[PDB]
Amino acid sequence: NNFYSVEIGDSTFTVLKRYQNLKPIGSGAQGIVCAAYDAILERNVAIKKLSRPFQNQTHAKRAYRELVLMKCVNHKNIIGLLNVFTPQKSLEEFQDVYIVMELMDANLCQVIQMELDHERMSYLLYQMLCGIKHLHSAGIIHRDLKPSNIVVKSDCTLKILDFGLARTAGTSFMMTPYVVTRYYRAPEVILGMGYKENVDLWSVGCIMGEMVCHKILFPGRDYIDQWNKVIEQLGTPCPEFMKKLQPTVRTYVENRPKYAGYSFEKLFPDVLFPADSEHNKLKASQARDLLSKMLVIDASKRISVDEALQHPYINVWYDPSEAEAPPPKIPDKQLDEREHTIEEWKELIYKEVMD
Amino acid sequence: HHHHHGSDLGKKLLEAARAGQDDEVRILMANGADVNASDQLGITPLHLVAITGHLEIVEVLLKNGADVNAHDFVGTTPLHLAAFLGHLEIVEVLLKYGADVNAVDRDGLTPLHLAAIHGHLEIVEVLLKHGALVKAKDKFGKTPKDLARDNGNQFIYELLEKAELLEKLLLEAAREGHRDRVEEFIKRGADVNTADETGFTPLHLAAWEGHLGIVEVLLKNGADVNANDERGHTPLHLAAYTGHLEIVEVLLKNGAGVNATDVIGTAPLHLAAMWGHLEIVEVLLKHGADVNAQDKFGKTPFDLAIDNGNEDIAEVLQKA
Amino acid sequence: PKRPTTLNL
Ligand SMILES: Nc1ncnc2c1ncn2[C@@H]1O[C@H](CO)[C@@H](O)[C@H]1O
């Protein structure tokens, strides 16, 4: 018919005949991502394949959630949907879902490792914050930003790939050998506290500090050891913070070995930053000042997305059409709250694919 | 005038346990350190070693007399920490040495809550095997199944849901009068002291419907004789209301509260006189029911007998 | 200043 199959390694991609010359570009928790040439659009696209998402309740929840958001969210700094199809003809035969999205050049692992100047470092962080603020205007808190799900293009544009974890999603998604999620997990999530919208700035602080140090800031050996790596660097938090913790978590945190931490001048010395740009705001001290406001254990004392966009290191590139863009209207008011059975998820996802 | 001083090795033992130095802990215990050394926050060495997860030294502390159910200033027992951090090995040895499975902290959390919050399935099984309250509510009225749902641990959610359903069937089996079903659900592990949304236990429903055989079976399996519903009614209240003599006498033999009152102040003797069960009134008086008991309105059992026109019962109450 | 227009690899 109008479909054809191509063997990509061990995965089998049954894509539309319009998508030719499929080539692998990355491996994720949901499956393999391929780059193709859309002969109809005469442009390069990216295709990822979801295999029986409904069969897993958590994957069904994410697949539907991300299908809904991918459609209605249109923004310069969030990856854009181009097509959605399934090769199966009926609801009973329904199996796989293919998402066609804008094709980017690489992920942040190539940019974090290379040596950047202040102009590109701040502009990439600005593009990140614009995407985060747009997601927040729709009521989505990402809580899962890491170099692996942030992609860039050779013209220095940045886009967020996924929409993170919901409130009920948990600490992590399915397995992948190319990512360690706990490194960028925020203290609120670690210690079982509630999380606010500024939880995403902790991820940004870890990513920004990684652009400067060229190594993982907080490399925990296990889930609860991640807290040790955080306090060893930033210092044991104040008693004001620990009072908000649940009893058992508080008992653990109180009886941890006390660490005084290091000042951000010792954590991020001037030598680790590039030469001070010709712009007055793009100084090594300004980038360190932004880090001192993001990498903060107490979310109550951490700055917000709007405050970071007004920070002198970021405010250089402020454009209201990018930061104060009109928020997207999500059609499903119970996007994250709905619970269904495996066959109810199957029919719910199938309808999103077909219209 | 007299100035006492102490060697205070417990502070050194607390630090050696917090740092996870097992050789120093053994050396300090061998030099006289108290295994129950308390911090200003109430932390004992058993707390700190449970956090580090050193099973060998946990058992040495327990063998030397450490309080297995010590709680700190926020009410955290070592079992809370072991359930929070996922130390199955320490959870089992703590329960082996007599830990409280339903130990509760400042915010009403049991160890089953913490295992459900952080997705330690095997610990949930061990906690439930040792008799954890499946429907234990906290400061916010959330059961462990609710917290498993809130943290996305579906497998623990589905595990606790089937355990709640089994308790739900035991309740209806006791109400309907199916003795074989009641005994079957007890063998499968259903908590004999489970409660519904308004506080009725299986013993409440069995006494209400007059299922004496099931009342005896539940009591033989360790049911709470004086469990309260939200209104404050014990099984003896409902038994006195129905006028079922055989159940009233069985409840009293197993230690029922003859003078228990509800939110209004109504005692089993009030109900027996209210509904004209002279035979029940005599037995309640035989077990020492208070005749002068007043409700919120100042009505004694004699008053309610006079109000409802039970002339025979009011005479018995008058002589007492 | 003007936004950067190139990012190598
Ligand atoms: N639209 C996409 N464009 C470019 N690369 C992608 C895309 N989606 C996924 N990838 C690659 O796969 C990884 C995770 O799927 C990313 O880190 C990236 O390397």
Side-chain angles (χ1 to χ4, degrees), chain A residues 24-35 45-48 70 79-80 100-110 146-152 159-161 176 178-179:
Chain A
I25 52 178
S27 166
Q30 284 159 294
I32 295 304
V33 185
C34 287
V45 299
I47 305 167
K48 77 177 186 190
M70 203 76 174
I79 200 78
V100 182
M101 73 206 78
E102 311 172 312
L103 175 61
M104 294 294 271
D105 291 7
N107 65 110
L108 259 190
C109 267
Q110 290 72 0
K146 47 220 180 178
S148 75
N149 53 57
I150 299 173
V151 286
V152 294
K159 290 170 175 290
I160 306 178
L161 275 186
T176 179
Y178 296 94
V179 199

Side-chain angles (χ1 to χ4, degrees), chain A residues 155-215:
Chain A
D155 70 329
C156 201
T157 58
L158 184 145
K159 290 170 175 290
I160 306 178
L161 275 186
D162 61 336
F163 299 87
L165 303 151
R167 202 160 301 275
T168 317
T171 63
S172 58
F173 196 62
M174 297 183 168
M175 38 214 64
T176 179
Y178 296 94
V179 199
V180 178
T181 307
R182 86 173 68 95
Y183 295 166
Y184 313 86
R185 192 131 57 209
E188 311 97 289
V189 185
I190 300 173
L191 303 181
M193 306 160 54
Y195 69 87
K196 205 171 57 182
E197 313 213 331
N198 66 346
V199 77
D200 289 316
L201 275 91
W202 182 268
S203 312
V204 177
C206 296
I207 291 178
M208 180 183 181
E210 204 167 326
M211 300 172 165
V212 182
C213 283
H214 291 103
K215 58 164 62 181

Side-chain angles (χ1 to χ4, degrees), chain A residues 171-172 180-186 189-191 216 218-232 252 256, chain B residues 51-54 81 84-87 118 120:
Chain A
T171 63
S172 58
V180 178
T181 307
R182 86 173 68 95
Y183 295 166
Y184 313 86
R185 192 131 57 209
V189 185
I190 300 173
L191 303 181
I216 290 92
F218 312 110
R221 306 172 189 163
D222 62 80
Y223 180 98
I224 200 67
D225 183 67
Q226 180 70 16
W227 176 250
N228 296 346
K229 300 292 178 290
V230 170
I231 56 175
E232 283 167 10
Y252 175 82
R256 282 281 76 190
Chain B
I51 292 171
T52 64
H54 291 57
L81 298 162
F84 159 65
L85 300 160
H87 301 311
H118 307 274
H120 302 291

Side-chain angles (χ1 to χ4, degrees), chain A residues 301-313:
Chain A
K301 303 171 170 163
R302 198 182 307 153
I303 73 166
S304 70
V305 189
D306 297 62
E307 290 167 66
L309 285 164
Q310 290 298 304
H311 190 281
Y313 194 74

Side-chain angles (χ1 to χ4, degrees), chain A residues 110 114 120 154-155 279 317 319 322, chain C:
Chain A
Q110 290 72 0
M114 56 178 284
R120 287 171 183 80
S154 48
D155 70 329
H279 200 261
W317 326 100
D319 190 314
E322 301 167 339
Chain C
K2 192 49 190 173
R3 301 161 175 208
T5 181
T6 170
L7 192 59
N8 60 312
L9 200 75

Side-chain angles (χ1 to χ4, degrees), chain B residues 78-95:
Chain B
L79 186 62
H80 286 89
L81 298 162
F84 159 65
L85 300 160
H87 301 311
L88 175 80
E89 310 81 17
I90 283 80
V91 166
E92 288 178 333
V93 70
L94 284 178
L95 297 168

Side-chain angles (χ1 to χ4, degrees), chain B residues 126-177:
Chain B
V126 175
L127 286 178
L128 289 169
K129 187 178 181 64
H130 285 75
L133 199 72
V134 190
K135 295 185 190 171
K137 300 182 198 309
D138 67 334
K139 183 190 201 76
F140 316 95
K142 289 196 165 292
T143 60
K145 190 194 78 161
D146 292 334
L147 299 175
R149 177 188 197 110
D150 290 351
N151 287 91
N153 304 126
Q154 275 297 298
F155 285 120
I156 296 190
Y157 178 83
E158 296 175 26
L159 183 85
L160 297 165
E161 202 175 39
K162 279 194 174 180
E164 290 188 3
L165 184 77
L166 186 70
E167 291 187 4
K168 180 211 183 213
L169 269 61
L170 175 64
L171 278 163
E172 306 167 354
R175 177 158 52 195
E176 213 63 30

Side-chain angles (χ1 to χ4, degrees), chain B:
Chain B
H1 192 297
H2 278 341
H3 324 288
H4 282 250
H5 204 88
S7 191
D8 284 344
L9 308 187
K11 303 173 188 176
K12 287 182 157 176
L13 175 63
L14 285 171
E15 294 309 310
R18 178 180 301 195
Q21 179 63 3
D22 310 322
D23 302 287
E24 183 71 21
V25 168
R26 296 177 179 267
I27 286 300
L28 290 158
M29 284 184 299
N31 288 298
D34 179 26
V35 299
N36 285 283
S38 182
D39 177 63
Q40 181 195 317
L41 299 172
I43 282 293
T44 67
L46 189 63
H47 282 101
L48 302 166
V49 186
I51 292 171
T52 64
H54 291 57
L55 171 80
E56 275 191 354
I57 293 85
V58 161
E59 210 164 358
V60 178
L61 290 176
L62 293 164
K63 278 193 174 189
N64 285 340
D67 193 337
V68 73
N69 292 298
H71 57 275
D72 71 335
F73 68 108
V74 291
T76 291
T77 67
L79 186 62
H80 286 89
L81 298 162
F84 159 65
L85 300 160
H87 301 311
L88 175 80
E89 310 81 17
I90 283 80
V91 166
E92 288 178 333
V93 70
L94 284 178
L95 297 168
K96 182 188 166 190
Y97 284 86
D100 193 340
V101 197
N102 305 269
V104 80
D105 63 356
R106 173 180 178 272
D107 289 355
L109 299 164
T110 73
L112 189 62
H113 289 91
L114 295 159
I117 288 173
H118 307 274
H120 302 291
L121 169 64
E122 199 162 356
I123 286 183
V124 175
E125 297 179 0
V126 175
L127 286 178
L128 289 169
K129 187 178 181 64
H130 285 75
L133 199 72
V134 190
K135 295 185 190 171
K137 300 182 198 309
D138 67 334
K139 183 190 201 76
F140 316 95
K142 289 196 165 292
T143 60
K145 190 194 78 161
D146 292 334
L147 299 175
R149 177 188 197 110
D150 290 351
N151 287 91
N153 304 126
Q154 275 297 298
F155 285 120
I156 296 190
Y157 178 83
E158 296 175 26
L159 183 85
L160 297 165
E161 202 175 39
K162 279 194 174 180
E164 290 188 3
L165 184 77
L166 186 70
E167 291 187 4
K168 180 211 183 213
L169 269 61
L170 175 64
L171 278 163
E172 306 167 354
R175 177 158 52 195
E176 213 63 30
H178 311 332
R179 183 182 184 159
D180 302 357
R181 283 273 195 259
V182 175
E183 287 175 78
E184 170 185 352
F185 294 155
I186 295 181
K187 271 204 169 183
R188 287 217 288 262
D191 188 359
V192 79
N193 292 287
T194 180
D196 73 326
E197 302 76 24
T198 180
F200 290 119
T201 69
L203 188 55
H204 281 89
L205 310 174
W208 170 272
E209 299 285 351
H211 303 318
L212 167 60
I214 293 178
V215 170
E216 299 172 329
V217 165
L218 296 174
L219 289 166
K220 192 169 191 177
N221 290 267
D224 196 340
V225 199
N226 293 277
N228 287 26
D229 64 340
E230 193 187 7
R231 311 151 186 83
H233 300 310
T234 64
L236 186 57
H237 278 96
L238 311 182
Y241 159 82
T242 65
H244 198 283
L245 181 75
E246 299 80 45
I247 285 180
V248 172
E249 292 178 311
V250 167
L251 293 177
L252 290 169
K253 179 186 182 175
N254 284 262
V258 68
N259 292 307
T261 64
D262 73 321
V263 297
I264 299 180
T266 299
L269 189 60
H270 285 111
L271 297 175
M274 196 185 302
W275 301 111
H277 303 308
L278 172 73
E279 310 85 13
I280 300 293
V281 176
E282 297 179 317
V283 170
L284 288 174
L285 292 174
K286 184 186 188 178
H287 288 70
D290 186 13
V291 192
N292 305 314
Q294 300 185 355
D295 60 347
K296 200 172 178 73
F297 312 117
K299 299 269 182 178
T300 70
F302 171 83
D303 293 6
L304 303 181
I306 288 296
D307 289 347
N308 291 42
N310 302 114
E311 189 179 6
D312 298 314
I313 291 190
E315 297 178 27
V316 176
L317 296 168
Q318 180 70 4
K319 71 191 176 187

